[PDB]
Design an enzyme around this catalytic site. Structure first.
Site, PDB file in Angstrom:
ATOM      1  N   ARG A  24       0.818  -1.210   0.000  1.00 56.73           N
ATOM      2  CA  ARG A  24       0.000   0.000   0.000  1.00 56.73           C
ATOM      3  C   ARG A  24       0.863   1.277   0.000  1.00 56.73           C
ATOM      4  NH1 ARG A  24      -5.355  -2.072   3.485  1.00 56.73           N
ATOM      5  NH2 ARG A  24      -4.715  -4.278   3.463  1.00 56.73           N
ATOM      6  N   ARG A  28      -3.758   6.531   0.512  1.00 57.53           N
ATOM      7  CA  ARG A  28      -4.337   7.730   1.113  1.00 57.53           C
ATOM      8  C   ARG A  28      -3.489   8.560   2.086  1.00 57.53           C
ATOM      9  NH1 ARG A  28     -10.220   5.237   2.581  1.00 57.53           N
ATOM     10  NH2 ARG A  28      -8.921   3.462   3.239  1.00 57.53           N
ATOM     11  N   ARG A  37      -6.671  10.660  -6.730  1.00 56.19           N
ATOM     12  CA  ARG A  37      -7.861   9.905  -6.353  1.00 56.19           C
ATOM     13  C   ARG A  37      -9.109  10.798  -6.455  1.00 56.19           C
ATOM     14  NH1 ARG A  37     -12.433   7.777  -6.020  1.00 56.19           N
ATOM     15  NH2 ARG A  37     -12.953   6.528  -4.168  1.00 56.19           N
ATOM     16  N   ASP A  74      -6.831  -3.383  -7.531  1.00 59.67           N
ATOM     17  CA  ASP A  74      -7.494  -3.920  -6.341  1.00 59.67           C
ATOM     18  C   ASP A  74      -7.595  -5.433  -6.513  1.00 59.67           C
ATOM     19  OD1 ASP A  74      -9.283  -2.819  -3.898  1.00 59.67           O
ATOM     20  OD2 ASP A  74     -10.224  -4.640  -4.693  1.00 59.67           O
ATOM     21  N   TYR A 145     -14.349 -12.922   0.509  1.00 59.05           N
ATOM     22  CA  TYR A 145     -14.854 -11.591   0.162  1.00 59.05           C
ATOM     23  C   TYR A 145     -16.211 -11.745  -0.515  1.00 59.05           C
ATOM     24  CZ  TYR A 145     -11.216  -8.058   1.103  1.00 59.05           C
ATOM     25  OH  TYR A 145     -10.364  -7.184   1.740  1.00 59.05           O
TER      26      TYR A 145
END
Lengths: 336, 337
Positions: A24, A28, A37, A74, A145
């Protein structure tokens, strides 16, 4: 690439420093990332925007000086071609919608995730400083998931599905294993220098269940990849201390592990490559603590190759960029 | 007691079958438990009510037929005598209030938790069917509750305290270790047949942090208990696969572990007693699954003693009484070949 420390290390060749990249690393916590983004509201749309995805993938290289770039995408993208609706709810996480009937899934067509391969190629042409890492979620994690519809705090549905419906569980794991295999093969064909398999949710399983319901599929997936290409394969899994004795059986070039294990000790017990494994939370502490915990680990690494420094999991959105860069630099300047 | 399977197993003596008891065997899932709980204002008051705590302690014996009773109490009670406010807001969880300064804690006076020793005594007087288990939270877990002021779900504060303020961390762990030691000793004097140390929150630590900041305190705690009495000591810890190689060094009589390890395999590599370790979530499944998961484990246990069946962690308040009864009887009916 000009810098091939990551590749040399994975191949067990001589290196003058341990390579470092962080899960990552494009995220963010990075001001530059948030700016890009913000240009595309929907995250899935962003993943499909080759220009912006390429731009994001390159951010870590310029900002952190890491030894490798992992493409921006992703782990859930390969699910959409199966007929699953994939959406990301801001501040809410992913939401996956489908009938819940395995037979309703459509046969996987790798070309439906073409944008991912396009990004890999674009990133390879945009820079030649470092290797490019391709990736996919592992079969079990994607299965969970899907069964949980995107998120869960107890994973009851996953467990009940696995325990009470072994026929459908196998049917779904076979589909996801072949899907991830085909998907990863295309990433390698597109130019990925390394591929990493993310099995982030296996820590929710007992050792007994991992061995019976996951191990067979992962072993197959990794062996098939190694038969297909010499591209290094890294297998990341949480609850590492629980599954480590089984995972070493895989033909993975490196096992990316969390802080439940001691990498220096693993290198003394297993003839295998390892990546990791600083607890991300250490980044919330003072640089003094970050320094002692990080150098404390690097000084204990008993080998000079087949080791790649990384965190035991991904960076969190609220970590300080200054401290993240500080961490990367501690590793980059540590003489072997 | 009439049934001493638990003690014989822990002492490594011959047993006709494996003994079983379950963490959190007494809970709201039992109607009688709910009626007794409504007899008192607060949860701490209930813990201090010797008559009712004793009644609750006995319920699992009558309802489940388990092989041992664990006194009804909470791991947070010895923190009150240290000058910490201990509250249990129903619907939210435990809340701990104190200055945050180790120097503000008061010297532990074991008599301040006398009600606990009275419950042990009362329970032993109330029945002679099975052994009684005394217990306490382990020092690290109690420290984390103190730093987090209750629950956290990230233990960020605990970690920062531990990494950035090692002097105060040591001072607090020293206090908590000596407090738990004295507290457990009083329970033993009161008649506890076994004492279990619960280190429920260490799973939030890296292996290196456990070895450096927890291991020394737990090793001391257990060795001191064993020097004090032959009373069997059980050390329970989450993140079992992570700390198992260190935990076996403790002078504990048995290690209660979770589902991250395989007990049959542990018995083949370690000369220690083991308790556990069925994943509690199995109880949400069908009785067929529970049967398959439980018998699947039992049939692989390679030893004939030093094994005590239990879950890998406490029962969840919402698990079904009928299914829990099923599990207990499944174990009690398993023949030792």
């Amino acid at each position: 690439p000009k810098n091939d420390l990551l590749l040399r290390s994975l191949r067990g060749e001589p290196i003058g420093r341990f390579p470092v990249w962080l899960m990552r690393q494009a995220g963010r916590y990075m001001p530059e990332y948030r700016k890009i983004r913000n240009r595309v509201k929907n995250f899935l749309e962003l993943c499909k925007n080759v220009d912006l995805a390429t731009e994001i993938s390159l951010l870590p290289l310029k900002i952190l000086g890491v030894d490798a770039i992992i493409i921006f995408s992703d782990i859930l993208v390969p699910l959409e071609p199966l007929g699953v609706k994939v959406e990301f709810v801001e501040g809410e996480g992913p939401k996956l919608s489908w009938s819940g009937k395995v037979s309703d899934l459509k046969k996987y067509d790798p070309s439906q995730n073409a944008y991912v391969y396009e990004i890999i190629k674009r990133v390879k042409e945009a820079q030649d400083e470092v290797p490019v890492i391709g990736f996919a979620g592992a079969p079990f994690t994607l299965l969970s998931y899907l069964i949980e519809g995107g998120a869960s705090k107890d994973f009851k549905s996953t467990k009940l599905f696995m325990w009470e419906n072994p026929k459908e569980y196998k049917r779904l794991m076979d589909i996801l294993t072949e899907t991830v295999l085909a998907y990863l093969k295309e990433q390698i064909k597109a130019g990925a220098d390394v591929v990493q398999i993310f099995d982030s949710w296996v820590n929710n399983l007992s050792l007994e269940d991992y061995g019976e319901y996951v191990y067979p599929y992962v072993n197959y997936l990794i062996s098939e990849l190694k038969d297909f290409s010499d591209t290094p394969v890294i297998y990341f899994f949480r609850g590492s201390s629980s599954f480590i004795d089984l995972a070493v059986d895989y033909r993975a070039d490196a096992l990316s592990v969390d802080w439940s294990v001691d990498i220096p000790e693993l290198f003394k017990i297993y003839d295998k490559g390892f990546q990791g494994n600083l607890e991300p939370a250490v980044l919330y502490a003072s640089e003094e603590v970050i320094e002692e915990k990080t150098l404390g680990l690097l000084r204990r690494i008993p080998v000079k190759t087949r080791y790649v420094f990384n965190l035991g999991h991904g960076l969190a959105p609220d970590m300080e960029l200054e401290k993240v860069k500080y961490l990367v630099d501690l590793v980059k300047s540590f003489p072997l």
